[PDB]
Amino acid sequence: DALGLIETKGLVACIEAADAMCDAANVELIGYENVGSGLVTAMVKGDVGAVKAAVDSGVESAQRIGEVVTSLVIARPHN
Amino acid sequence: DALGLIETKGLVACIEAADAMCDAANVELIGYENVGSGLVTAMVKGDVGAVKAAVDSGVESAQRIGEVVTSLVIARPHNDI
Amino acid sequence: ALGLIETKGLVACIEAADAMCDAANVELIGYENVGSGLVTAMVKGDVGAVKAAVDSGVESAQRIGEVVTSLVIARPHNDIN
Amino acid sequence: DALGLIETKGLVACIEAADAMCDAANVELIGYENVGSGLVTAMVKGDVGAVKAAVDSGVESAQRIGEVVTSLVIARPHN
Amino acid sequence: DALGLIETKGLVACIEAADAMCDAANVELIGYENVGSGLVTAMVKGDVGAVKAAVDSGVESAQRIGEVVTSLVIARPHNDINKI
Amino acid sequence: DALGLIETKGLVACIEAADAMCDAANVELIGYENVGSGLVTAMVKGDVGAVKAAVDSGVESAQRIGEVVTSLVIARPHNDI
């Protein structure tokens, strides 16, 4: 199904984005990824509609406490 | 129970934030996390009241010696976190 | 043939990899991360398919993030690891 | 026992800070810690008075050859 | 045996430098080191003549796609270096 | 015994500094240390005279190919160092 991503500067903003994503819609948190330079990504999976709602909520909440670098929804991601 | 987080620029400010958190309330220091660009986070667990008091004290103390980037208290963290 | 796109940040890299796979008959080998936010996506296929994939991946990744470098190696040396 | 910390940009400035700390007062060098991004911390232990003297001397000496990012004395660290 | 080194800003320029080095002469790719701030080094070994040719080719090719920070050939590395 | 240190931006400049240090005087290469952000330190030990000569030569040679960030000679390091 669809993939939702939120990349923030700092771990705390990422945890807030992931918490908000799970509370907003029927999505499953796959995990976190850290590529250095403070860039932390939270990844969720679910139906396109749930993932779009999750990413929107996650971005809004994370922005309140930290910097959201990028966000993306891939409706039909290749394996 | 509740999760308390303080993210600082540099290790020394993080150690001060963690020391202040443990001294302020009945919370347990889970550990540290470092995501690069000098961003270091200290994490504690306990009842929401103890965690709120710990985070408040940790932020105030760490700010005196370094930069606090972010702080957060999650009363009931999601199972997936 | 090997196709490479290095970005600043993971999300731009995932977008570059998604665009590469959708543009031509190439296989995503994987990702590589050397820190400092530098993330590379690697694809394999015929030189024509890989050139088309890299072009499309760069164009789409640039719309959401910074593409640091891109490269097509038509015939990689065995020692390339 | 009090904890003395000096965080520098670079390892050489940190080694100079640690050498100066040990020569200034009756403190023991516990070790060095590195969190990446060139941030290196030297940690000493001893009585609060010895640790304050050590940190002051370590900062002054390290600044002559490199950048001191932060310094701290914790008179009674949590166990 | 001589040691050849090329340090680039980023992994992709480094891959290009290492690919070019192996294609240019009879050298063996030992591997790579990464020390942060995006600095990636590719290391080769062989006779001094093969290593000089490999490094020259690797630098020329890598520069076309990225930044080459430094390059070096050590004709007879010190015994203490051989540990790394 | 004296301690000699050279910290460079990049591994290659550090290897050149270490090679030059060993060739300049009767010093022993203890090893290398990397604290991130491209900062790499080469450490030698020997008599104060040999270490001063080694560091001088290492700095001059390393500067030709890269950036020397710092250099230091400690004539009498504390045992704890």
Pairing of strands A2-9, A67-74: antiparallel
Q: Using only the alpha carbons of chain A, give its radius of gyration.
A: 11
- Which of A10, A18, A22 is opposite residue B35, by nearest beta carbon? A10
User: E12–C71: do the CB atoms touch at under 8 Å?
Assistant: yes
Which residues of chain A are at the B interface, by a Cβ-Cβ cutoff of 8 Å? 9-13, 15-16, 18-19, 22-23, 28-29, 34, 36-40, 65-66
Could you give the CA distance from residue E47 to residue E75 in angstroms, rounded to a whole number? Answer: 8
- Which of F9, F16, F34 is opposite residue E72, by nearest beta carbon? F16
To 10 degrees, the CA torsion angle through B50, B53, B56, B59?
Answer: -50
Residue with tokens 């590195």: D34
How far is Cα of residue B71 from the mean position of the Cα atoms in its chain? Answer: 7
Residue of D nearest to E38 (CA): D37
Q: Which residues of C touch B36 (CB under 8 A)?
A: 35-37
Q: Which residues of F touch E71 (CB under 8 A)?
A: 12, 65
> How far is residue E40 from each of residues A16, B8, C18, E46, measured CA to CA in Å?
33, 28, 26, 21
**What element of type H or E holds C3?**
strand C2-8
Residue of A7, A8, A9, A11 for testing the chain B interface, max B β-carbons within 10 Å? A11
User: B12–D74: do the CB atoms touch at under 8 Å?
Assistant: no
Give the DSSP letter string of C12-60. HHHHHHHHHHHHSS-EEEEEEE-STTEEEEEEES-HHHHHHHHHHHHHH
Which residues of chain C are at the A interface, by a Cβ-Cβ cutoff of 8 Å? 8-12, 14-15, 18, 21-22, 28, 33, 35-39, 64-65
Residues for chain D: how many in total? 79
Q: Are F66 and F8 in contact (CB under 8 A)?
A: yes
Residue of B nearest to A66 (CA): B70
SS3 per residue for chain D: CEEEEEEEECHHHHHHHHHHHHHHCCCEEEEEEECCCCEEEEEEEECHHHHHHHHHHHHHHHHCCCEEEEEEEECCCCC
Sheet holding D28-34, edge to edge: D28-34, D39-46, D2-9, D67-74
Q: Name the neighbours of A, counting chains with at least 3 Cβ pairs within 8 A.
A: B, C
Q: To the nearest whole angstrom, how far is the Cα of A74 from the nearest Cα of chain B?
A: 21
Strands, E assignment, F1-81: 2-9, 28-34, 39-46, 67-74
Tell which residue, C64, C58, C61, C4, has the closest CA to residue C34.
C4
Q: To the nearest whole angstrom, how far is the Cα of D12 from the nearest Cα of chain F?
A: 7
Residue with tokens 């002559």: D64
Q: Which residues of D touch F75 (CB under 8 A)?
A: none
Q: Which residues of D touch E36 (CB under 8 A)?
A: 36-38
User: D18–F81: do the CB atoms touch at under 8 Å?
Assistant: yes
Q: Which residues of C touch A41 (CB under 8 A)?
A: 9-11
User: F33–D11: do the CB atoms touch at under 8 Å?
Assistant: yes
Q: To the nearest whole angstrom, how far is the Cα of E76 from the nearest Cα of chain C?
A: 23
Residue of F nearest to E7 (CA): F12
SS3 per residue for A1-61: CEEEEEEEECHHHHHHHHHHHHHHCCCEEEEEEECCCCEEEEEEEECHHHHHHHHHHHHHH
To 10 degrees, the CA torsion angle through B63, B68, B74, B78?
Answer: -150
The 3-state DSSP class for residue B17 equals: helix
Residue of E8, E11, E16, E63 for testing the chain C interface, max C β-carbons within 10 Å? E11
Q: Are E22 and E58 in contact (CB under 8 A)?
A: no
The experimental technique behind this entry is: X-ray
> How far is residue B79 from each of residues B31, B76, D76, measured CA to CA in Å?
19, 9, 36
Give the DSSP letter string of E5-73. EEEEESHHHHHHHHHHHHHHSS-EEEEEEE-STTEEEEEEEE-HHHHHHHHHHHHHHHHHHS-EEEEEE
User: D78–B37: do the CB atoms touch at under 8 Å?
Assistant: no
One-letter amino acid of F33? E
- What angle, rounded to 10 degrees, do the helices at D48-63 and D11-24 form? 140
- Which of D10, D22, D23 is opposite residue F39, by nearest beta carbon? D10
CB proximity list for A30: less than 8 A, separation 6 or greater: A43, A44, A45
User: F70–D38: do the CB atoms touch at under 8 Å?
Assistant: no
Q: Are E7 and C7 in contact (CB under 8 A)?
A: no
Residues for chain E: how many in total? 84
Could you give the CA distance from residue B71 to residue A76 in angstroms, rounded to a whole number? Answer: 35
- Which of B18, B19, B34 is opposite residue D35, by nearest beta carbon? B34
- Which of C14, C22, C36 is opposite residue A37, by nearest beta carbon? C36
Q: How many residue contacts between A and B have a Cβ separation below 8 Å?
A: 63
